[PDB]
């Protein structure tokens, strides 16, 4: 139905924090290793940050630590913000 069609995509959130990503550190979006852990992306803490408070002016989630290090890469990030548990 048109309403489930409308939901933000796990491919539509991992393309997200790519540009997020990408924009942050100066690099294409296309070539940001979403299998690695985040916090060697060279994010600084302020994007970490402001990276948190985008995802939850986003979706609504207000990204936990536990979720987040259980998650501690861009896809597997992103399938969790959208699945959930």
Do not use: C, Y
């Amino acid at each position: 139905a048109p309403a489930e069609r409308a939901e933000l995509t796990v491919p539509e959130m991992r393309q997200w924090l790519r540009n997020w990503v990408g924009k942050a550190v100066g690099k294409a979006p296309d070539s940001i290793d979403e299998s690695v852990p985040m916090v060697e992306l060279g994010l600084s803490s302020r994007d970490a940050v402001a990276m948190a408070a985008d995802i939850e002016d986003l979706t609504g989630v207000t990204l936990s630590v536990a979720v987040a290090f259980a998650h501690p890469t861009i896809e597997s990030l992103a399938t969790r913000i959208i699945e959930g548990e």
